[PDB]
Structure formats: structure tokens, C-alpha cells
Design a protein around this ligand. Structure first.
Ligand SMILES: NC(=O)C1=CN([C@@H]2O[C@H](COP(=O)(O)OP(=O)(O)OC[C@H]3O[C@@H](n4cnc5c(N)ncnc54)[C@H](OP(=O)(O)O)[C@@H]3O)[C@@H](O)[C@H]2O)C=CC1
Ligand SMILES: CCCC/C(=C\c1coc2nc(N)nc(N)c12)c1ccccc1OC
Length: 186
């Protein structure tokens, strides 16, 4: 299996969600960037895997489940089977990554993308090993009820640029944002 990554968009006060929706109005190109980064696989004959918590799964519009062109894995201890339209279910992050070595997935998965929510980010970010974070800084405050965990910059280095990632300031609906890539290996 290929790289492990988190991807997120976050406001200036670290907000990532408000009642199961985005804190900010829809940013169409921002969401296109999410789609592009998580869908594009470096290796032929493979797909990327997305790993998300249960509330993040159900935050995707019902008609739009699963995220297409990627294998969709949901994390939950309550659920007993993958929800409608999902591919895999694991009880924890360590279990999902372990599953990625099994016969059923070892040769099918390229990159793994953790796409939220808060507690799955936090566990991944605190997990030893080589990990990148793709972080969109939405450069305004927005009322939020779920937050991105602290990025420890002692270990996560902000990269000076990255292929396929625009480095300059974007703006949609009057809201300026910019794309960043962090990397750790510990
Ligand atoms: N970039 C962005 O701006 C992002 C925004 N979001 C937003 O935040 C909201 C959802 O976030 P949040 O509330 O933090 O929820 P999560 O998606 O992490 O979902 C929580 C549920 O999934 C299960 N879960 C989470 N982590 C694990 C784990 N390691 N093992 C097993 N189960 C786990 C639990 O399920 P159970 O109780 O069934 O065990 C829990 O109730 C979304 O609705 C969305 O609006 C989400 C991702 C990114
Ligand atoms: C499975 C997550 C699908 C994308 C999502 C949130 C993001 C998670 O990581 C992300 N990373 C980036 N750069 N942008 C994002 N927007 C998300 C989302 C969830 C519910 C409703 C709308 C949403 O975006 C319009």
C-alpha cells in the first residue's frame, strides 16, 4: 500500500464543521481540489482508499455516497456492517490500516486518505510513521462545533511547495484560502 495522508479544510479558529456541514458557504473549487487530491492515484490498476468516521460519512449528501473512484471505509464501533453505499467498516484506525494488508485490499489500494472527523485526525496525527497533512487554510473565522486538532510543528514540516498544489492565495465567494502540505516522519 502507498502513502498515508490526512486532508482537511480549516478556518482560522480551527473549525472544520458545524452541525454536520461545513462552517463556510460552499467553495466549489475547494471541493474540486479535495476530490482531485483524494481520487488521483500514483499507481495503475489501483484506487486510493478514504477512511472517515461515521458522522463524516453521513455528512456526505445521500445521493453522493460513496465518494466515486475511491474505496470508502467507515470507522464505527456501533455499526455492524458498512452503511448503505460504503465499502468497508472497521472498528478503529489501527484496524483499518491493518485491513489494508489483507488479501482483499493489499493489491487494490494505493494512497490512504483520512478525511475526518476530529478524533480520527487526532489519532492519525499522533501515530508514528511517515504522514502528510494536506490542509486548506480558510483565512476567516467561522462559527464551528467541531475542530481540527493541534498541528505540532516540531514534527510536521510545512513544505515550501508541492506538485499539483497551487501555492498562491485562492478566493471564492469573497473568502480567501490557501493550500498547504505538511510532512512528518517519526
Ligand atoms: N475538512 C473539513 O472541513 C472536514 C469537515 N468534517 C465535518 O465534521 C463533521 C463530522 O465530524 P466528527 O463529529 O468529528 O465525526 P467523525 O466522522 O469522526 O465521526 C464520529 C463517529 O465515527 C466513529 N469513529 C470516529 N473515530 C473512530 C475510531 N477510531 N474508531 C471507531 N469509530 C470511530 C464513532 O462512531 P460510533 O459511535 O458508531 O463508534 C463516532 O460517533 C462532519 O459532519 C463534517 O461537516 C469532517 C471531515 C473534514
Ligand atoms: C468525506 C468528506 C467530503 C468532503 C467534506 C469535507 C472535507 C473533508 O476533508 C476536506 N478537505 C478539503 N480540502 N476540503 C474539504 N471540504 C474537506 C464535506 C463533508 C460534508 C459536506 C461537504 C463537504 O465538502 C464540501
Amino acid at each position: 500500500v502507498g502513502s498515508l495522508n490526512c486532508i482537511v479544510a480549516v478556518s482560522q479558529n480551527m473549525g472544520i464543521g458545524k452541525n454536520g456541514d461545513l462552517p463556510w458557504p460552499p467553495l466549489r473549487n475547494e471541493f474540486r481540489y479535495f476530490q482531485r487530491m483524494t481520487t488521483t492515484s500514483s499507481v495503475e490498476g489501483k484506487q486510493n482508499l478514504v477512511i472517515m468516521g461515521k458522522k463524516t460519512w453521513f455528512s456526505i449528501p445521500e445521493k453522493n455516497r460513496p465518494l466515486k473512484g475511491r474505496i470508502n471505509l467507515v470507522l464505527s464501533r456501533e455499526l455492524k456492517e458498512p452503511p448503505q453505499g460504503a465499502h468497508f467498516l472497521s472498528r478503529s484506525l489501527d484496524d483499518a490500516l491493518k485491513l489494508t494488508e489483507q488479501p482483499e485490499l493489499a493489491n487494490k489500494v494505493d494512497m490512504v486518505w483520512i478525511v475526518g472527523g476530529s478524533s480520527v485526525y487526532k489519532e492519525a496525527m499522533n501515530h508514528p510513521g511517515h504522514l502528510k497533512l494536506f490542509v486548506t487554510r480558510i483565512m476567516q473565522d467561522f462559527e464551528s462545533d467541531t475542530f481540527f486538532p493541534e498541528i505540532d510543528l516540531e514534527k510536521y514540516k510545512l513544505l515550501p511547495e508541492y506538485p499539483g498544489v497551487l501555492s498562491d492565495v485562492q478566493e471564492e465567494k469573497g473568502i480567501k484560502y490557501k493550500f498547504e502540505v505538511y510532512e512528518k516522519n517519526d
